[PDB]
Protein backbone atom coordinates (compact mmCIF):
# COMPACT_ATOMS: atom_id res chain seq x y z
CA UNK A 1 0.00 0.00 0.00
CA UNK A 2 1.72 3.12 -1.29
CA UNK A 3 0.82 6.82 -1.40
CA UNK A 4 -1.05 7.34 -4.67
CA UNK A 5 -3.11 4.17 -4.37
CA UNK A 6 -4.10 5.16 -0.82
CA UNK A 7 -5.12 8.55 -1.98
CA UNK A 8 -7.03 7.34 -4.99
CA UNK A 9 -8.77 4.92 -2.56
CA UNK A 10 -9.50 7.58 0.05
CA UNK A 11 -10.79 9.78 -2.76
CA UNK A 12 -13.23 7.10 -3.76
CA UNK A 13 -14.30 6.40 -0.19
CA UNK A 14 -15.17 10.08 0.25
CA UNK A 15 -17.11 10.08 -2.96
CA UNK A 16 -19.02 7.02 -1.75
CA UNK A 17 -19.73 8.59 1.61
CA UNK A 18 -21.26 11.49 -0.33
CA UNK A 19 -23.39 9.21 -2.47
CA UNK A 20 -24.71 7.67 0.78
CA UNK A 21 -25.35 11.19 1.95
CA UNK A 22 -27.42 11.74 -1.20
CA UNK A 23 -29.34 8.58 -0.38
CA UNK A 24 -29.97 9.78 3.13
CA UNK A 25 -31.32 13.04 1.71
CA UNK A 26 -33.78 11.30 -0.58
CA UNK A 27 -35.27 9.56 2.49
CA UNK A 28 -35.64 12.75 4.52
CA UNK A 29 -37.34 14.26 1.48
CA UNK A 30 -39.57 11.25 1.58
CA UNK A 31 -40.66 12.05 5.16
CA UNK A 32 -41.49 15.59 4.11
CA UNK A 33 -38.32 17.24 5.35
CA UNK A 34 -36.65 20.27 3.67
CA UNK A 35 -33.66 19.34 1.44
CA UNK A 36 -33.81 22.71 -0.41
CA UNK A 37 -31.23 21.75 -3.06
CA UNK A 38 -28.88 19.68 -0.89
CA UNK A 39 -29.12 16.89 -3.51
CA UNK A 40 -27.73 19.01 -6.30
CA UNK A 41 -25.19 20.63 -3.93
CA UNK A 42 -23.89 17.17 -3.02
CA UNK A 43 -23.59 16.04 -6.66
CA UNK A 44 -21.54 19.21 -7.42
CA UNK A 45 -19.16 18.47 -4.55
CA UNK A 46 -18.66 14.97 -5.92
CA UNK A 47 -17.68 16.43 -9.26
CA UNK A 48 -15.34 18.98 -7.78
CA UNK A 49 -13.71 16.21 -5.77
CA UNK A 50 -13.05 13.96 -8.77
CA UNK A 51 -10.54 16.52 -10.08
CA UNK A 52 -8.44 16.74 -6.93
CA UNK A 53 -4.98 15.17 -6.72
CA UNK A 54 -2.59 14.39 -3.85
CA UNK A 55 -0.93 17.52 -2.46
CA UNK A 56 2.04 17.68 -0.11
CA UNK A 57 3.30 20.84 1.51
CA UNK A 58 7.03 20.50 1.77
CA UNK A 59 8.15 22.76 4.61
CA UNK A 60 11.59 23.41 6.06
CA UNK A 61 14.94 24.99 5.38
CA UNK A 62 16.63 23.63 2.27
CA UNK A 63 19.89 23.19 4.17
CA UNK A 64 18.05 20.65 6.32
CA UNK A 65 17.81 18.50 3.19
CA UNK A 66 14.12 18.82 2.45
CA UNK A 67 14.62 18.14 -1.24
CA UNK A 68 16.24 14.78 -0.54
CA UNK A 69 13.35 13.80 1.71
CA UNK A 70 10.63 14.30 -0.91
CA UNK A 71 12.43 12.69 -3.86
CA UNK A 72 13.32 9.82 -1.53
CA UNK A 73 9.69 9.33 -0.58
CA UNK A 74 8.23 9.58 -4.06
CA UNK A 75 10.83 7.11 -5.29
CA UNK A 76 12.52 9.12 -8.06
CA UNK A 77 15.42 11.57 -8.20
CA UNK A 78 14.16 15.09 -8.84
CA UNK A 79 15.20 15.38 -12.49
CA UNK A 80 13.67 12.03 -13.61
CA UNK A 81 10.31 13.60 -12.73
CA UNK A 82 11.27 16.66 -14.79
CA UNK A 83 10.92 19.31 -12.08
CA UNK A 84 13.38 21.62 -10.27
CA UNK A 85 12.82 23.55 -7.05
CA UNK A 86 13.71 27.24 -6.65
CA UNK A 87 15.58 28.37 -3.52
CA UNK A 88 14.04 31.83 -3.10
CA UNK A 89 10.90 33.52 -4.42
CA UNK A 90 8.70 35.61 -2.10
CA UNK A 91 5.54 33.82 -3.26
CA UNK A 92 3.87 30.46 -2.97
CA UNK A 93 4.96 27.84 -5.43
CA UNK A 94 3.70 24.61 -6.89
CA UNK A 95 5.55 21.75 -8.54
CA UNK A 96 3.70 19.09 -10.55
CA UNK A 97 6.22 16.30 -11.12
CA UNK A 98 5.96 14.09 -14.19
CA UNK A 99 6.51 10.45 -15.04
CA UNK A 100 4.93 9.43 -11.72
CA UNK A 101 2.13 6.85 -11.44
CA UNK A 102 -0.41 9.58 -10.79
CA UNK A 103 -0.29 13.36 -10.59
CA UNK A 104 0.48 15.26 -7.41
CA UNK A 105 1.11 18.82 -6.38
CA UNK A 106 4.03 19.94 -4.22
CA UNK A 107 3.40 23.27 -2.56
CA UNK A 108 5.92 25.33 -0.61
CA UNK A 109 6.75 28.80 0.56
CA UNK A 110 10.45 29.25 -0.31
CA UNK A 111 10.77 32.83 0.98
CA UNK A 112 10.53 31.65 4.62
CA UNK A 113 13.28 29.06 4.24
CA UNK A 114 9.51 40.28 6.25
CA UNK A 115 9.32 37.37 3.85
CA UNK A 116 6.98 36.46 6.75
CA UNK A 117 4.12 38.31 5.02
CA UNK A 118 3.21 35.19 3.04
CA UNK A 119 1.87 33.61 6.23
CA UNK A 120 -0.95 36.13 6.15
CA UNK A 121 -1.89 35.70 2.48
CA UNK A 122 -5.29 34.01 2.13
CA UNK A 123 -3.96 32.28 -0.97
CA UNK A 124 -0.92 30.51 0.46
CA UNK A 125 -2.97 29.76 3.56
CA UNK A 126 -5.68 28.09 1.42
CA UNK A 127 -3.18 25.98 -0.52
CA UNK A 128 -1.52 24.65 2.62
CA UNK A 129 -4.80 24.22 4.50
CA UNK A 130 -6.11 22.15 1.53
CA UNK A 131 -3.07 19.87 1.40
CA UNK A 132 -3.39 16.26 2.47
CA UNK A 133 0.09 15.92 3.88
CA UNK A 134 2.61 18.35 5.36
CA UNK A 135 6.28 17.51 5.80
CA UNK A 136 8.18 19.80 8.06
CA UNK A 137 11.77 18.72 7.50
CA UNK A 138 14.31 19.58 10.21
CA UNK A 139 17.90 18.73 11.24
CA UNK A 140 19.14 15.86 13.30
CA UNK A 141 21.99 17.74 15.03
CA UNK A 142 19.87 20.69 16.19
CA UNK A 143 16.18 20.01 15.30
CA UNK A 144 14.16 23.09 14.30
CA UNK A 145 15.92 26.29 13.37
CA UNK A 146 15.87 29.06 15.94
CA UNK A 147 13.90 31.44 13.70
CA UNK A 148 10.97 29.12 12.96
CA UNK A 149 8.86 29.50 16.09
CA UNK A 150 6.12 31.45 14.34
CA UNK A 151 5.98 29.13 11.30
CA UNK A 152 5.41 26.12 13.49
CA UNK A 153 2.66 28.16 15.17
CA UNK A 154 1.23 29.12 11.80
CA UNK A 155 0.94 25.49 10.77
CA UNK A 156 -0.13 23.93 14.04
CA UNK A 157 -2.11 26.68 15.66
CA UNK A 158 -3.30 29.17 13.02
CA UNK A 159 -3.94 26.62 10.24
CA UNK A 160 -4.68 23.81 12.62
CA UNK A 161 -2.94 21.07 10.58
CA UNK A 162 -1.22 19.12 13.33
CA UNK A 163 -3.20 15.92 12.56
CA UNK A 164 -1.81 16.10 9.00
CA UNK A 165 1.79 17.21 9.61
CA UNK A 166 4.83 14.94 9.92
CA UNK A 167 7.95 16.47 11.39
CA UNK A 168 10.78 14.71 9.70
CA UNK A 169 14.03 14.65 11.59
CA UNK A 170 16.48 14.23 8.75
CA UNK A 171 20.20 13.37 8.56
CA UNK A 172 20.14 11.00 11.52
CA UNK A 173 23.41 9.58 10.15
CA UNK A 174 25.37 12.49 11.66
CA UNK A 175 23.97 11.70 15.09
CA UNK A 176 24.28 7.88 15.21
CA UNK A 177 25.29 4.62 13.52
CA UNK A 178 22.75 3.55 10.88
CA UNK A 179 24.06 0.01 11.51
CA UNK A 180 23.41 -0.26 15.24
CA UNK A 181 19.60 -0.72 15.31
CA UNK A 182 19.38 -0.33 19.11
CA UNK A 183 21.49 2.86 19.32
CA UNK A 184 19.50 4.53 16.52
CA UNK A 185 16.27 3.95 18.46
CA UNK A 186 17.91 5.41 21.58
CA UNK A 187 19.00 8.62 19.81
CA UNK A 188 15.82 8.70 17.72
CA UNK A 189 13.68 8.72 20.85
CA UNK A 190 15.78 11.41 22.52
CA UNK A 191 15.61 13.60 19.41
CA UNK A 192 11.85 12.94 19.15
CA UNK A 193 11.55 14.14 22.74
CA UNK A 194 13.66 17.26 22.22
CA UNK A 195 11.77 18.44 19.13
CA UNK A 196 8.54 17.60 20.90
CA UNK A 197 9.44 20.13 23.56
CA UNK A 198 10.41 22.91 21.14
CA UNK A 199 7.19 22.50 19.17
CA UNK A 200 5.02 22.47 22.22
CA UNK A 201 6.57 25.72 23.32
CA UNK A 202 6.59 27.40 19.90
CA UNK A 203 2.89 26.84 19.37
CA UNK A 204 1.35 26.74 22.89
CA UNK A 205 0.53 23.03 22.50
CA UNK A 206 -1.35 21.21 25.23
CA UNK A 207 -0.18 17.91 26.62
CA UNK A 208 -2.77 16.08 24.52
CA UNK A 209 -1.75 17.82 21.31
CA UNK A 210 1.85 16.89 22.07
CA UNK A 211 0.91 13.20 22.02
CA UNK A 212 -0.83 13.76 18.66
CA UNK A 213 2.39 15.04 17.11
CA UNK A 214 3.79 13.06 14.24
CA UNK A 215 7.57 12.71 14.34
CA UNK A 216 9.78 10.47 12.30
CA UNK A 217 13.54 10.11 12.27
CA UNK A 218 15.16 9.54 8.91
CA UNK A 219 18.36 9.79 6.86
CA UNK A 220 17.26 10.71 3.35
CA UNK A 221 20.83 10.63 1.98
CA UNK A 222 22.97 8.52 4.33
CA UNK A 223 26.80 8.67 4.37
CA UNK A 224 26.35 11.45 1.79
CA UNK A 225 26.72 9.16 -1.22
CA UNK A 226 23.50 10.30 -2.98
CA UNK A 227 20.07 9.11 -4.16
CA UNK A 228 21.00 8.21 -7.74
CA UNK A 229 23.36 5.74 -6.07
CA UNK A 230 21.13 4.55 -3.19
CA UNK A 231 18.20 3.69 -5.51
CA UNK A 232 20.52 1.20 -7.19
CA UNK A 233 20.55 -0.65 -3.82
CA UNK A 234 16.83 -0.26 -2.96
CA UNK A 235 16.56 -2.80 -0.13
CA UNK A 236 19.84 -1.85 1.50
CA UNK A 237 18.86 1.82 1.47
CA UNK A 238 15.45 1.28 3.14
CA UNK A 239 16.95 -0.49 6.15
CA UNK A 240 19.47 2.32 6.59
CA UNK A 241 17.52 5.46 5.76
CA UNK A 242 14.43 4.35 7.74
CA UNK A 243 12.41 5.93 4.92
CA UNK A 244 9.76 3.25 5.39
CA UNK A 245 8.94 4.79 8.79
CA UNK A 246 8.05 7.97 6.83
CA UNK A 247 6.08 6.35 4.01
CA UNK A 248 4.08 4.44 6.65
CA UNK A 249 3.28 7.48 8.79
CA UNK A 250 2.30 9.35 5.67
CA UNK A 251 0.08 6.48 4.67
CA UNK A 252 -1.85 6.53 7.95
CA UNK A 253 -2.47 10.26 7.73
CA UNK A 254 -3.73 10.03 4.24
CA UNK A 255 -5.99 7.25 5.47
CA UNK A 256 -7.58 9.60 7.97
CA UNK A 257 -7.03 13.12 6.73
CA UNK A 258 -7.86 12.85 3.01
CA UNK A 259 -11.61 12.63 3.49
CA UNK A 260 -11.63 15.51 6.01
CA UNK A 261 -9.65 17.65 3.57
CA UNK A 262 -11.95 16.84 0.68
CA UNK A 263 -15.16 17.36 2.74
CA UNK A 264 -14.11 20.67 4.23
CA UNK A 265 -12.73 21.92 0.88
CA UNK A 266 -16.21 21.42 -0.73
CA UNK A 267 -18.24 22.53 2.31
CA UNK A 268 -19.83 19.11 2.77
CA UNK A 269 -18.49 18.54 6.25
CA UNK A 270 -21.26 20.81 7.43
CA UNK A 271 -24.00 19.33 5.19
CA UNK A 272 -23.11 15.83 6.32
CA UNK A 273 -22.97 16.64 10.04
CA UNK A 274 -26.46 18.11 9.82
CA UNK A 275 -27.92 15.20 7.87
CA UNK A 276 -26.44 12.54 10.09
CA UNK A 277 -27.73 14.53 13.05
CA UNK A 278 -31.30 14.59 11.74
CA UNK A 279 -31.22 10.89 10.97
CA UNK A 280 -29.79 9.88 14.30
CA UNK A 281 -32.46 12.02 15.88
CA UNK A 282 -35.10 10.72 13.53
CA UNK A 283 -34.62 7.03 14.48
CA UNK A 284 -34.30 7.79 18.19
CA UNK A 285 -37.82 9.28 18.07
CA UNK A 286 -39.23 6.68 15.68
CA UNK A 287 -38.25 4.23 18.43
CA UNK A 288 -40.40 6.20 20.81
CA UNK A 289 -43.25 6.28 18.29
CA UNK A 290 -43.01 2.54 17.64
CA UNK A 291 -43.18 1.84 21.37
CA UNK A 292 -46.36 3.85 21.57
CA UNK A 293 -48.03 2.43 18.51
CA UNK A 294 -47.10 -1.12 19.38
CA UNK A 295 -48.37 -0.82 22.97
CA UNK A 296 -51.56 0.88 21.77
CA UNK A 297 -52.20 -1.76 19.17
CA UNK A 298 -51.62 -4.52 21.73
CA UNK A 299 -53.90 -2.87 24.31
CA UNK A 300 -56.75 -2.86 21.76
CA UNK A 301 -56.52 -6.63 21.44
CA UNK A 302 -56.05 -6.88 25.18
CA UNK A 303 -59.28 -4.89 25.63
CA UNK A 304 -61.28 -7.22 23.39
CA UNK A 305 -59.96 -10.22 25.29
CA UNK A 306 -60.98 -8.64 28.60
CA UNK A 307 -64.41 -8.13 27.24
CA UNK A 308 -64.57 -11.74 26.10
CA UNK A 309 -63.50 -13.07 29.46
CA UNK A 310 -65.81 -10.67 31.18
CA UNK A 311 -68.69 -11.87 29.09
CA UNK A 312 -67.75 -15.51 29.70
CA UNK A 313 -67.70 -14.86 33.42
CA UNK A 314 -71.07 -13.13 33.59
CA UNK A 315 -72.59 -15.94 31.59
CA UNK A 316 -71.23 -18.36 34.17
CA UNK A 317 -72.77 -16.36 37.01
CA UNK A 318 -76.11 -16.06 35.21
CA UNK A 319 -76.22 -19.84 35.01
CA UNK A 320 -75.26 -20.39 38.63
CA UNK A 321 -78.01 -17.86 39.41
CA UNK A 322 -80.44 -19.82 37.35
CA UNK A 323 -79.38 -23.07 38.98
CA UNK A 324 -79.99 -21.53 42.41
CA UNK A 325 -83.40 -20.11 41.53
CA UNK A 326 -84.50 -23.38 39.95
CA UNK A 327 -83.75 -25.36 43.14
CA UNK A 328 -85.58 -22.79 45.20
CA UNK A 329 -88.67 -23.26 43.07
CA UNK A 330 -88.41 -27.05 42.87
CA UNK A 331 -87.98 -27.12 46.65
CA UNK A 332 -91.05 -24.96 47.40
CA UNK A 333 -93.11 -26.98 44.93
CA UNK A 334 -92.23 -30.34 46.52
CA UNK A 335 -93.13 -28.92 49.91
CA UNK A 336 -96.49 -27.89 48.58
CA UNK A 337 -97.74 -30.98 46.85
CA UNK A 338 -97.99 -33.22 49.95
CA UNK A 339 -99.70 -30.72 52.26
CA UNK A 340 -103.12 -31.34 53.91
CA UNK A 341 -105.33 -28.32 54.64
CA UNK A 342 -104.02 -27.87 58.19
CA UNK A 343 -100.51 -27.57 56.79
CA UNK A 344 -101.31 -24.59 54.61
CA UNK A 345 -101.05 -21.66 56.96
CA UNK A 346 -97.78 -22.80 58.41
CA UNK A 347 -96.58 -23.04 54.82
CA UNK A 348 -97.64 -19.55 53.78
CA UNK A 349 -96.19 -18.04 56.95
CA UNK A 350 -92.86 -19.75 56.86
CA UNK A 351 -92.11 -20.03 53.18
CA UNK A 352 -94.05 -17.30 51.32
CA UNK A 353 -95.06 -14.61 53.80
CA UNK A 354 -98.63 -13.71 54.79
CA UNK A 355 -99.71 -10.14 55.56
CA UNK A 356 -102.77 -7.82 55.25
CA UNK A 357 -101.12 -6.75 51.95
CA UNK A 358 -101.28 -10.43 50.97
CA UNK A 359 -98.93 -13.30 50.19
CA UNK A 360 -95.42 -13.33 48.76
CA UNK A 361 -93.20 -10.94 50.72
CA UNK A 362 -90.93 -13.59 52.24
CA UNK A 363 -90.35 -15.30 48.93
CA UNK A 364 -89.80 -12.01 47.22
CA UNK A 365 -87.04 -11.00 49.61
CA UNK A 366 -85.30 -14.29 49.11
CA UNK A 367 -85.47 -14.19 45.35
CA UNK A 368 -84.39 -10.55 45.52
CA UNK A 369 -81.34 -11.31 47.60
CA UNK A 370 -80.27 -13.95 45.03
CA UNK A 371 -80.76 -11.54 42.13
CA UNK A 372 -79.08 -8.71 43.94
CA UNK A 373 -76.11 -11.02 44.68
CA UNK A 374 -75.66 -11.77 40.96
CA UNK A 375 -76.19 -8.16 39.94
CA UNK A 376 -73.35 -7.28 42.35
CA UNK A 377 -70.92 -10.04 41.38
CA UNK A 378 -71.66 -9.16 37.74
CA UNK A 379 -71.35 -5.39 38.36
CA UNK A 380 -67.96 -6.18 39.95
CA UNK A 381 -66.87 -8.00 36.78
CA UNK A 382 -67.59 -4.93 34.72
CA UNK A 383 -65.69 -2.92 37.27
CA UNK A 384 -62.55 -5.03 36.93
CA UNK A 385 -62.80 -4.63 33.19
CA UNK A 386 -63.09 -0.84 33.43
CA UNK A 387 -60.08 -0.84 35.73
CA UNK A 388 -57.85 -2.65 33.24
CA UNK A 389 -58.84 -0.59 30.28
CA UNK A 390 -58.43 2.45 32.49
CA UNK A 391 -55.06 1.31 33.79
CA UNK A 392 -53.59 0.75 30.30
CA UNK A 393 -54.95 3.97 28.79
CA UNK A 394 -53.29 5.77 31.63
CA UNK A 395 -49.93 4.16 30.97
CA UNK A 396 -50.08 5.27 27.34
CA UNK A 397 -50.90 8.81 28.49
CA UNK A 398 -47.94 8.57 30.84
CA UNK A 399 -45.59 7.27 28.15
CA UNK A 400 -46.58 10.08 25.78
CA UNK A 401 -46.27 12.69 28.55
CA UNK A 402 -42.59 11.84 29.06
CA UNK A 403 -41.69 12.26 25.40
CA UNK A 404 -41.93 16.07 25.31
CA UNK A 405 -44.32 18.01 23.11
CA UNK A 406 -41.80 18.22 20.27
CA UNK A 407 -40.64 14.62 20.27
CA UNK A 408 -41.99 13.88 16.77
CA UNK A 409 -40.99 17.05 14.94
CA UNK A 410 -37.85 15.30 13.65
CA UNK A 411 -40.12 12.83 11.90
CA UNK A 412 -41.10 15.45 9.34
CA UNK A 413 -44.22 16.52 7.51
CA UNK A 414 -47.10 14.91 9.38
CA UNK A 415 -45.87 16.31 12.76
CA UNK A 416 -45.70 19.98 11.89
CA UNK A 417 -48.30 22.52 10.77
CA UNK A 418 -52.04 22.88 11.18
CA UNK A 419 -52.81 19.14 10.95
CA UNK A 420 -49.86 18.10 12.96
CA UNK A 421 -49.87 15.00 15.07
CA UNK A 422 -48.08 15.24 18.43
CA UNK A 423 -47.85 13.48 21.74
CA UNK A 424 -50.56 15.81 22.92
CA UNK A 425 -52.90 15.10 19.99
CA UNK A 426 -52.65 11.41 20.66
CA UNK A 427 -52.81 11.84 24.39
CA UNK A 428 -56.14 13.70 23.99
CA UNK A 429 -57.82 10.91 22.11
CA UNK A 430 -56.76 8.45 24.76
CA UNK A 431 -57.97 10.68 27.68
CA UNK A 432 -61.38 11.30 26.16
CA UNK A 433 -61.69 7.53 25.82
CA UNK A 434 -60.65 7.08 29.44
CA UNK A 435 -63.14 9.78 30.40
CA UNK A 436 -66.04 8.19 28.57
CA UNK A 437 -65.17 4.99 30.44
CA UNK A 438 -64.98 6.63 33.86
CA UNK A 439 -68.58 7.84 33.36
CA UNK A 440 -69.97 4.55 32.08
CA UNK A 441 -68.54 2.63 35.06
CA UNK A 442 -71.06 2.51 37.89
CA UNK A 443 -72.88 0.64 40.61
CA UNK A 444 -76.46 1.73 40.10
CA UNK A 445 -79.56 1.85 42.25
CA UNK A 446 -82.93 1.57 40.48
CA UNK A 447 -85.98 1.09 42.75
CA UNK A 448 -88.43 -1.61 41.60
CA UNK A 449 -91.68 -1.54 43.60
CA UNK A 450 -93.41 -4.71 44.66
CA UNK A 451 -97.06 -5.35 45.42
CA UNK A 452 -98.11 -8.53 47.24
CA UNK A 453 -100.80 -10.85 45.89
CA UNK A 454 -104.19 -10.73 47.66
CA UNK A 455 -105.69 -14.13 48.38
CA UNK A 456 -109.09 -15.04 47.03
CA UNK A 457 -111.89 -14.78 49.63
CA UNK A 458 -112.56 -18.50 48.98
CA UNK A 459 -108.93 -19.33 49.85
CA UNK A 460 -108.59 -16.77 52.68
CA UNK A 461 -110.85 -18.92 54.93
CA UNK A 462 -108.34 -21.83 55.03
CA UNK A 463 -105.43 -19.57 55.97
CA UNK A 464 -106.85 -17.72 58.95
CA UNK A 465 -106.65 -14.13 60.13
CA UNK A 466 -103.19 -12.66 59.46
CA UNK A 467 -100.61 -12.68 62.25
CA UNK A 468 -102.73 -14.72 64.69
CA UNK A 469 -102.45 -18.21 66.16
CA UNK A 470 -104.68 -20.28 63.94
CA UNK A 471 -106.01 -23.83 63.85
CA UNK A 472 -109.07 -24.66 61.72
CA UNK A 473 -112.44 -24.72 63.52
CA UNK A 474 -115.05 -27.50 63.69
CA UNK A 475 -117.63 -25.22 62.01
CA UNK A 476 -115.35 -24.89 58.99
CA UNK A 477 -114.23 -28.51 58.68
CA UNK A 478 -117.75 -29.95 58.79
CA UNK A 479 -119.15 -27.61 56.12
CA UNK A 480 -117.95 -30.06 53.43
CA UNK A 481 -117.81 -33.80 52.94
CA UNK A 482 -114.45 -35.39 51.94
CA UNK A 483 -114.89 -35.11 48.15
CA UNK A 484 -116.10 -31.48 48.61
CA UNK A 485 -112.96 -30.83 50.76
CA UNK A 486 -110.14 -32.63 48.91
CA UNK A 487 -111.34 -30.59 45.92
CA UNK A 488 -111.24 -27.42 47.97
CA UNK A 489 -107.60 -28.34 48.76
CA UNK A 490 -106.80 -28.78 45.04
CA UNK A 491 -107.90 -25.29 44.05
CA UNK A 492 -105.96 -23.75 46.96
CA UNK A 493 -102.77 -25.47 45.89
CA UNK A 494 -103.44 -24.41 42.34
CA UNK A 495 -103.57 -20.93 43.91
CA UNK A 496 -100.26 -21.11 45.69
CA UNK A 497 -98.38 -22.59 42.77
CA UNK A 498 -99.41 -19.69 40.55
CA UNK A 499 -98.12 -17.40 43.29
CA UNK A 500 -94.89 -19.38 43.71
CA UNK A 501 -94.11 -19.65 40.02
CA UNK A 502 -94.88 -16.12 38.93
CA UNK A 503 -91.81 -14.35 40.28
CA UNK A 504 -89.42 -16.90 38.81
CA UNK A 505 -91.05 -17.04 35.36
CA UNK A 506 -90.28 -13.38 34.84
CA UNK A 507 -86.61 -13.55 35.73
CA UNK A 508 -86.00 -16.80 33.87
CA UNK A 509 -87.14 -14.98 30.68
CA UNK A 510 -84.40 -12.41 31.29
CA UNK A 511 -81.67 -14.94 31.95
CA UNK A 512 -82.68 -17.08 29.01
CA UNK A 513 -81.31 -14.49 26.54
CA UNK A 514 -77.83 -12.91 26.60
CA UNK A 515 -79.08 -9.71 24.96
CA UNK A 516 -81.49 -9.14 27.86
CA UNK A 517 -79.31 -10.66 30.47
CA UNK A 518 -76.49 -8.36 29.56
CA UNK A 519 -78.78 -5.34 29.12
CA UNK A 520 -80.14 -5.65 32.66
CA UNK A 521 -77.18 -6.83 34.76
CA UNK A 522 -74.15 -5.54 32.80
CA UNK A 523 -74.87 -2.95 30.08
CA UNK A 524 -71.54 -1.15 30.53
CA UNK A 525 -69.66 -4.08 28.97
CA UNK A 526 -71.32 -3.36 25.62
CA UNK A 527 -70.91 0.36 26.21
CA UNK A 528 -67.17 -0.01 26.88
CA UNK A 529 -66.83 -2.21 23.83
CA UNK A 530 -68.25 0.64 21.73
CA UNK A 531 -65.68 3.04 23.18
CA UNK A 532 -62.87 0.61 22.60
CA UNK A 533 -64.12 0.01 19.06
CA UNK A 534 -64.04 3.76 18.37
CA UNK A 535 -60.63 4.26 19.84
CA UNK A 536 -59.41 1.57 17.44
CA UNK A 537 -60.61 3.51 14.41
CA UNK A 538 -58.99 6.79 15.54
CA UNK A 539 -55.69 4.97 15.76
CA UNK A 540 -55.28 4.52 12.03
CA UNK A 541 -53.68 7.78 11.13
CA UNK A 542 -50.51 7.06 13.15
CA UNK A 543 -50.39 3.48 12.00
CA UNK A 544 -50.35 4.75 8.42
CA UNK A 545 -47.50 7.07 9.37
CA UNK A 546 -45.51 4.72 11.47
CA UNK A 547 -45.40 2.24 8.62
CA UNK A 548 -44.12 4.71 6.02
CA UNK A 549 -41.53 5.94 8.50
CA UNK A 550 -40.31 2.46 9.39
CA UNK A 551 -39.83 1.42 5.80
CA UNK A 552 -38.02 4.70 5.44
CA UNK A 553 -35.76 4.26 8.49
CA UNK A 554 -34.78 0.76 7.43
CA UNK A 555 -33.14 2.34 4.40
CA UNK A 556 -31.58 5.13 6.46
CA UNK A 557 -30.09 2.63 8.86
CA UNK A 558 -28.57 0.87 5.88
CA UNK A 559 -27.10 4.07 4.50
CA UNK A 560 -25.69 4.93 7.85
CA UNK A 561 -23.67 1.79 8.54
CA UNK A 562 -20.67 2.98 6.54
CA UNK A 563 -20.82 6.39 8.32
CA UNK A 564 -20.39 4.48 11.64
Residue numbers in the entry: 1 to 113, 121 to 571
What does the paper say about this structure?
Members of the dynamin family are large GTPases that couple nucleotide hydrolysis to membrane remodelling. Here, we show by sequence analysis and X-ray crystallography that LeoA is a bacterial dynamin-like protein (DLP). Here, we present data demonstrating that the leoABC genes, encoded within a pathogenicity island from enterotoxigenic Escherichia coli (ETEC) strain H10407, are dynamin-like proteins. This is important because LeoA has previously been linked with the secretion of heat labile enterotoxin (LT) through membrane vesicle (MV) biogenesis and release from the bacterial cell surface. Bacterial DLPs (BDLPs) share many of the qualities exhibited by eukaryotic DLPs—they polymerise, exhibit GTPase activity and assemble on lipid into filaments.
